[PDB]
Design a protein around this nucleic acid. Structure first.
Ligand code: MG
Ligand code: MG
Ligand code: MG
Ligand code: ZN
Lengths: 143, 129, 49, 143
RNA sequence: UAAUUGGAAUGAGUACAAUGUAAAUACCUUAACGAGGAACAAUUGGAGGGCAAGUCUGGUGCCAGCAGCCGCGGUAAUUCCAGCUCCAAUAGCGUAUAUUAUGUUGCAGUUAAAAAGCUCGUAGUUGAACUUUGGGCCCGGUUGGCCGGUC
RNA sequence: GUCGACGUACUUCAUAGGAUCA
């Protein structure tokens, strides 16, 4: 119950944002041909700093060589690499622990299960690629 | 029957590099296949290659080296104006700063960021990324 | 306990582009040039009757 | 290729092929032929007049029951007689017999504990005045 | 939580006047009046709560359910949910009907929409490769680096 | 004529699967 949060406003999230990418955000970006950095600019209408965690990068490197273009996208120089103090576990678990320990990232992901478990935590907006672009759900500073 | 010879060439390269082979044999070979391949070669997607010569259409042998993710042809060679360059490269590339759309202008066969500089346009052939 | 599988039949003459000719005429040919205006004026004048 | 042509001189084929296989789309043939409203109960209209033919459940003991609230109403365009709801059961005193009720669709979004399948209309104006303006005692019914 | 009360503030309105305008009216400006329930009396919708010496229905008792503007008196008298609690939009708010968020890009056809029984065939769409390639010299644009002479 | 073949309009039938607990 941090000093920033209102009832559900969560006013420590502000421009420029910091998003956390899941492993199937990348897949549906490559599939629907949106681009990471400009796609988040085109929805949030603010600067962005996509972040990728050591658990997620390990998972990408675990996929193999059929998915090497997504790995090429993830080692891009202007996607920063947040390092994580973990054993090295499943990606979605590492995302949930990051979210609970700081409550100032928005989470870009596409699996339904991780969507539910994030939605329990109050004040964490939740980007996801749908249709043709990056729709954002629980952010009260949209337009 | 056989209509696009370039489509056959790029499909044969694509198949025989998916499966991991090392050199490809593509029969026939127009001037367009040589120039499209020299454009792919300049950017490092294929190794050298060589035209072997019978007294017929002629064959090519390409030396692949791994770095090729996809290549293809756009089949009606659509006329592309100068803003349609960037609508085309947003439709058919998975991230808008790698991969090259290749197009046939009055100044040669070239990728798109060379046809931006020279300020030309023309028809559209294919793509690599 | 032997059940055979259904042979899914093949229709007879009842296809949405053949229904249009079953009445007196070719009903595709008696249409309008602006269906939106036909709709909004038809509704309003219905209410004013 | 796929089923369709693709050469750069076949717009005429593609344009005719869309112009034929477009009459096989029920909303298209519905909205050009002008069939689009026999779905709707009233004609083309949005309200419809009617004569109060009689009351139903005027001898029903259980108060505020739905069959207490329903009158039976003849429409003046067709001649067909239907049943109609009435809000606020006290407003059965306002409609008598040979009133002109002006009916509107009931259009209910949901179905309650003891409701009725079959009432599809509802009474809006009784002999010129409106039932919210008689029940709220603004106006009164001009006989 | 407030339910009394203390003075300060102002315009809706009314108005000498001037301005406005062809002439007026109104705005803008302004003497004099003009706020306690500031009775100088905001609205449209939907969700809940209780209302018994009441009625009605059903039953494995005192119950349940519907409902409750209907009770024992009383209507110049009863002075009662002071006048039940929330929620949303707000000088705006609701209801009905429609409509809105076919495939060029970009659909589907073995097994659940849909490949004509078959081949020939005119229009239509579509159609293999090839013809000056390559080198040498000069000129400088416009950048980028070493530069920054400058007050 | 509670007539047939259509053409419109509408209705309805088919929804549970795993895991743990009792
Ligand atoms: Mg079938
Ligand atoms: Mg022919
Ligand atoms: Mg040719
Ligand atoms: Zn971790």
């Amino acid at each position: 119950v941090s000093s920033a949060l209102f009832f559900q406003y969560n006013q420590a999230i502000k421009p420029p944002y910091q998003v956390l990418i899941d492993t199937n955000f990348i897949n549906f970006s490559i599939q629907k041909k949106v681009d990471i950095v400009r796609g988040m600019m085109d929805c949030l209408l603010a600067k962005c700093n996509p972040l990728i965690t050591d658990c997620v990068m390990a998972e990408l490197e675990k996929l193999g060589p059929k998915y090497r273009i997504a790995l090429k996208l993830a080692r891009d120089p202007r996607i920063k690499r947040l390092s994580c103090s973990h054993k090295g576990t499943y990606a979605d678990d590492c995302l949930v622990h990051r979210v609970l320990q700081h409550k100032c990232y928005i989470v870009a992901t596409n699996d339904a299960g991780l969507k539910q478990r994030i939605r329990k935590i109050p004040g964490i907006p939740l980007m996801s690629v749908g249709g043709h672009a990056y729709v954002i759900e629980k952010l009260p500073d949209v337009f | 029957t056989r209509s696009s010879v370039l489509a056959d060439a790029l499909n044969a390269i694509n198949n025989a590099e998916k499966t991991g082979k090392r050199q490809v044999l593509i029969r026939p070979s127009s001037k367009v296949i040589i120039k499209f391949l020299q454009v792919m070669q300049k950017h490092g997607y294929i190794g050298e290659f060589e035209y072997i010569d019978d007294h017929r259409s002629g064959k090519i042998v390409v030396q692949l080296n791994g770095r090729l993710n996809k290549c293809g042809v756009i089949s009606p060679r659509f006329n592309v104006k100068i803003g349609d360059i960037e609508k085309w490269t947003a439709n058919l590339l998975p991230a808008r700063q790698f991969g090259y759309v290749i197009l046939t202008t009055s100044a040669g066969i070239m990728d798109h960021e060379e046809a931006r500089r020279k300020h030309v346009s023309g028809k559209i052939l294919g793509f690599v990324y | 306990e032997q059940s055979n599988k259904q042979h899914r039949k093949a229709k007879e003459k009842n296809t949405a582009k053949k229904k249009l000719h079953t009445q007196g005429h070719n009903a595709k040919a008696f249409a309008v040039a602006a269906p939106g205006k036909m709709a909004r004026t038809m509704q309003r004048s219905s209410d004013v009757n | 290729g796929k089923g369709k042509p693709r050469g750069l001189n076949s717009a005429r084929k593609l344009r005719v092929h869309r112009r034929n296989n477009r009459w096989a789309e029920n909303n298209y043939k519905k909205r050009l032929l002008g069939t689009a409203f026999k779905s709707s109960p009233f004609g083309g209209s949005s309200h419809a007049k009617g004569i109060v033919l009689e009351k139903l459940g005027i001898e029903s003991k259980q108060p505020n029951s739905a069959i207490r609230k329903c009158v039976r109403v003849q429409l003046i365009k067709n001649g067909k007689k239907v049943t109609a709801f009435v809000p606020n059961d006290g407003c059965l005193n306002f409609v008598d017999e040979n009133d002109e009720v002006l009916l509107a669709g009931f259009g209910r979004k949901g179905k309650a504990k003891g409701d009725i399948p079959g009432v599809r209309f509802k009474v809006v104006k009784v002999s010129g005045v409106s039932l919210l303006a008689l029940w709220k005692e603004k106006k009164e019914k001009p006989r």
